[PDB]
Paper text:
Peptidyl-prolyl isomerase like 1 (PPIL1) is a cyclophilin and belongs to the so-called Prp19-related proteins. PPIL1 is a single domain cyclophilin and has been found to interact with the Ski-interacting protein (SKIP, also referred to as hPrp45, SNW domain-containing protein 1, nuclear receptor coactivator NCoA-62). Peptidyl-prolyl cis/trans isomerases (PPIases, E.C. 5.1.2.8) catalyze the isomerization of peptide bonds that precede a proline residue and can thereby facilitate folding of their substrate proteins. Second, PPIL1 can interact with the SKIP protein without involving its PPIase active site.
The crystal structure of PPIL1 in complex with the inhibitor cyclosporine A (CsA) was obtained at a resolution of 1.15 Å and exhibited two bound Cd2+ ions that enabled SAD phasing. The final model comprises full-length PPIL1 protein (except the very N-terminal Met) bound to CsA without any geometry violations and with good R-factors. PPIL1 exhibits the canonical cyclophilin fold comprising an eight-stranded antiparallel β-sheet capped on both sides by α-helices. All CsA-contacting residues of PPIL1 are conserved and exhibit the same side chain rotamers as observed for CypA in complex with CsA, rendering the active site geometry essentially identical to CypA and other CypA-type cyclophilins. The structure of the PPIL1·CsA complex contains two Cd2+ ions in an asymmetric unit. Both ions are coordinated by the PPIL1 protein and water molecules such that contacts between two neighboring PPIL1 molecules in the crystal lattice are established. were able to pinpoint a number of PPIL1 surface-exposed residues that undergo chemical shift perturbations upon titration with SKIP59–129. Strikingly, these residues (highlighted in Figure 4B) involve the residues His87, Asp89 and Cys133, which coordinate Cd2+ ions in the present crystal structure. Cd2+ ions are directly involved in crystal packing and it appears, thus, that Cd2+-mediated crystal packing has excluded the SKIP peptide from the crystals. The PPIL1·CsA crystal structure exhibits a generally more compact shape compared to a previously published NMR structure ensemble of PPIL1. In particular, the N-terminus of the protein is not disordered as reported for the NMR structure.
Author numbering:
A (entry chain B): 1 to 11
B (entry chain A): 3 to 166
Write the structure that this text describes.
């Protein structure tokens, strides 16, 4: 999907 | 040591392989986050790095010197706190904000939005916006990416620096 992570990127 | 609070360069420039983006910082709302970003830029920490993750009509993400998306560190010696404000919302393109891995996990990675992204409200520190170069940012957002949302041709930050 639409996240802005750092390490575990999600859908 | 960290710069003194008196040091508030109004701008950070990103000289990218596609041109210059002029960011203006929200020192009042996000003093710790602005200090971090401007100081990392001043140190050359972002020089030669890339936007490792770009998603059309969403955002461009960078700030990791390893380029993996897993790295980067702040000027504080530890990941630092969010500086959230209900009245700073993700209302449109050009907003500068921190990437993270949960609450109070700010490092060096950041993003610039390409459209409204209000589902991020209250989860990422907003600490500035594009004053000049939004046309460039719009174009950067359209670059072809692979299945991992990595640009197929590197979009580099050649140099980043605060106002002198
Ligand atoms: Na202070």
């Amino acid at each position: 999907x639409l996240l802005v992570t750092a390490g575990l990127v999600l859908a | 040591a960290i710069p003194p609070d008196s040091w508030q360069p109004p701008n950070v420039y990103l000289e990218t392989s596609m041109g210059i983006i002029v960011l203006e910082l929200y020192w009042k709302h996000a003093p710790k986050t602005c200090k971090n970003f401007a100081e990392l830029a001043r140190r050359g920490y972002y020089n030669g790095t890339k936007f490792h993750r770009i998603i059309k009509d969403f955002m461009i993400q960078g700030g990791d010197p390893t380029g993996t998306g897993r790295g980067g560190a702040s000027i504080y010696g530890k990941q630092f706190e969010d500086e959230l404000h209900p009245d700073l919302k993700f209302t449109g393109a050009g907003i500068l904000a921190m990437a993270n891995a949960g609450p109070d996990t700010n490092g060096s990675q950041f993003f610039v939005t390409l459209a409204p992204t209000q589902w991020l409200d209250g989860k990422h520190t907003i600490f500035g916006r594009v004053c000049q170069g939004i046309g460039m940012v719009n174009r950067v957002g359209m670059v072809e990416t692979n299945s991992q949302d990595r640009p197929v041709d590197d979009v580099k930050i050649i140099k980043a620096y605060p106002s002198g």
